[PDB]
Amino acid sequence: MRVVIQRVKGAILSVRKENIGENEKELEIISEIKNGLICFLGIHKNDTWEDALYIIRKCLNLRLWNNDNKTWDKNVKDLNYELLIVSQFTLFGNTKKGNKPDFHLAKEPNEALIFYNKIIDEFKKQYNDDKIKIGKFGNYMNIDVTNDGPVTIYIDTHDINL
């Protein structure tokens, strides 16, 4: 599994919404957080539950907020902050050969959805049902993010021995 974690003062996620209908075609906000993390999550085809757990553990526990003259001190749970988890297959975009990304390492959308939903449940079980927002899996999204720092963290779980 791969994840890119961004520290944020807020994030607003929107998808396309077509009233077919009333011939209305606009963006509508379906998810929103204030301070916290946005995590772009890429799932590898050979990912196991252990990979998910490491990611969840790291996202929930990384001390990324300063605190009273102490830096890199507080985690997203401590400050009672939120997480926005977006599935992001492009993180398994191989750009090593040619300038068209190739996504053969990506888990296929269907198995991915089940896995992803398992992850979201675990996030909630390990933190709080109300602190975890998500996007619209497999749909085009517009995400207004306020990067606070910025602080960007990258983790590839296939780097660790689990």
Add this chain to the structure above:
Amino acid sequence: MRVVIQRVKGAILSVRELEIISEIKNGLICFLGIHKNDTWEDALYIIRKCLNLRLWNNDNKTWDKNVKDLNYELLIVSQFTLFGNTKKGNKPDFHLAKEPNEALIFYNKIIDEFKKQYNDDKIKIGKFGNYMNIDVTNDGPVTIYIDTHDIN
């Protein structure tokens, strides 16, 4: 070198009462991490990939158009935290990251090469080594990661 590329409809960068100092419409924001043992070859790979990755649909085709074809912009932000090791604790430690003073020179060389390889007016930057607030409109999203240490 490590880079995270985000596809965007726009980005607004401010620095500390904040003031906006950089702004782009459609294009890419690129968070750039420089490794202590990085060479000019690593920079070139990153620059070439950023300018040439076909990340836009030109319709009926996918992954078809790149950032130059569309006359789009790039916002390059140095981002040492990309070398935050988190393998051994919950507190990132950043020793793979290049020392600040050498990093700045290197980083400025990169920005020049970006301009030389594209266009002086299409390349925006942040305030190196300063706290920044960046409002980004992610378009997709489309997130690309590259570690030039994976390549020879």
